[PDB]
């Protein structure tokens, strides 16, 4: 995020980091329950990547984080790689996340819910702060 600010630690408890086998953060995701993460299809997750829950400072070794194996990647069948449309994947965890103060789920909308233009929302992540 360019021109954002640091979050209060633990205050976005559904936010996960997708890390490759080398430990490199390459995408975010959101817990929707103890067993499932929603992310973008274009992130290209495989069962060799790791879901990391509970992080704030990825430079710290003192946070009680959960490194969760991925059992199966469910890319939305309507995902179109050419247009990047329907850009959603579900990750089924091999073992459940343990929910806590710092690890818990985001709500999902109904298909008919209205989120009007002009509404102020929030986005979070460990993406670049400067290109």
């Amino acid at each position: 995020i360019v021109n954002g600010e640091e979050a209060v630690p633990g205050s976005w408890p559904w936010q996960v980091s997708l890390q490759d086998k080398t430990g490199f953060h390459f995408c975010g995701g959101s817990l929707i329950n103890e067993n499932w993460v929603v992310t973008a299809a274009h992130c290209g997750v495989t069962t060799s990547d790791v879901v990391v829950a509970g992080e704030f400072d990825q430079g710290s070794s003192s946070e009680k984080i959960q490194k969760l194996k991925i059992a199966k990647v469910f890319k939305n069948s309507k995902y179109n790689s050419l247009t990047i449309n329907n850009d959603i994947t579900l990750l089924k965890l091999s073992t459940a996340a343990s929910f806590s103060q710092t690890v818990s789920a985001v709500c999902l909308p109904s298909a008919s819910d209205d989120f009007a233009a002009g509404t102020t929302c929030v986005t979070t992540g460990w993406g670049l702060t400067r290109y």
Partner: protein
């Protein structure tokens, strides 16, 4: 480029798809929602993470960080996967697995 160690946040407004098309044209599909163009931008490495809106006291996943400006320009809108268009598939997948 700068990658942060610490989790970042930003508030930002939802756009209409019609207005978003003024920036991105026919790249904008019904299963996308734009947000930003407001002095902040999602950027590389944010992809897959949440765009949440507070409704009746709870944060609800409205978007998934998807794509946008190749320089993360804060005056152009970011593009997010529109979760309302995708949630029936989420529910079907959870139910079947």
């Amino acid at each position: 480029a700068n990658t942060p160690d610490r989790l970042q946040q930003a508030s930002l407004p939802l756009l209409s798809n019609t207005n978003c098309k003024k920036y991105w044209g026919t790249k904008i599909k019904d299963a996308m929602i734009c947000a930003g163009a407001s002095g902040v931008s999602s950027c590389m490495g944010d992809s897959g993470g949440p765009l949440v809106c507070k409704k009746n006291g709870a944060w609800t996943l409205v978007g998934i960080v998807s794509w946008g400006s190749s320089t993360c320009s804060t005056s152009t809108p970011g593009v997010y996967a529109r979760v309302t268009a995708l949630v029936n598939w989420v529910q079907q997948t959870l139910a079947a697995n």
